[PDB]
Each structure stands twice: as structure tokens, then as C-alpha cells.
Design a protein around this ligand. Structure first.
Ligand code: NA
Length: 121
């Protein structure tokens, strides 16, 4: 049906919008601390600490697989990146501090992306 082609032409724009948003968020981590998944070879016990790992490349693979149905799912993943880091790492570390900074600077990008999703449907 054509009614599925109109749905696919919207998901394809959402996927096109979410790509810009992901790029803007990832520019707030110039140290690339959140670029890749935490290595299980380097942190063997990680999954004892954190049940749902998340990172930017993992979000990206999903994204290009049109796996985000909406902005709320995309946000959830972003928030995991931040909250996982803030549990696993102590307050006086470079990792925890990078998340605090990513959260603070990522808010401005997400406050406007909310309006652009609602605005353009
Ligand atoms: Na902690």
C-alpha cells in the first residue's frame, strides 16, 4: 500500500533528522570517551555493574537501521550513555565529569530537537 510508503517517507526524515541531532551531541564529546562501547576485554566485570551499556556507535548502527521509532527512544539511549558513566565512575574522575558536561550541553540540542519533531510531525 501507498499508506506504508507515506509512513516510510516520514521514518526516513526522522532518521535524517536524528542523524543531525546525533552528530551535534557527539560533537560535545571531543575526547571521544562515549564514542565506542566500554571494552569487556578491558573491563571484564562491566556487565555486573551496568545492565544496559550504551555508546554513540551503537546508537549510530541502530539509527542507520531506522530502528528509532521516535525521539523518546533516541533520548532514552542518550541518557543511558550518561547515567551508566555516572554510576560506574566516581565523581572525581575525568569520565564522570565528561558525562556531566555532555548532559548539560546535550540539553540545548534536545530542547530544540523536541520542537523540530513536533513542528514537522
Ligand atoms: Na558510582
Amino acid at each position: 500500500s501507498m499508506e506504508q510508503v507515506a509512513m516510510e517517507l516520514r521514518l526516513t526524515e526522522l532518521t535524517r533528522l536524528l542523524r543531525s541531532v546525533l552528530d551535534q551531541l557527539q560533537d560535545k564529546d571531543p575526547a571521544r570517551i562515549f564514542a565506542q562501547p566500554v571494552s569487556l576485554k578491558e573491563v571484564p566485570d562491566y556487565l555486573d555493574h551496568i545492565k544496559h551499556p550504551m555508546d554513540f556507535a551503537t546508537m549510530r548502527k541502530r539509527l542507520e537501521a531506522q530502528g528509532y521509532k521516535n525521539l523518546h527512544e533516541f533520548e532514552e539511549d542518550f541518557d543511558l550513555i550518561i547515567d551508566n558513566c555516572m554510576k560506574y565512575n566516581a565523581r572525581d574522575t575525568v569520565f564522570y565529569r565528561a558525562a556531566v558536561r555532555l548532559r548539560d550541553q546535550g540539553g540545548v540540542v534536545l530542547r530544540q530537537a523536541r520542537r523540530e519533531v513536533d513542528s514537522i510531525g
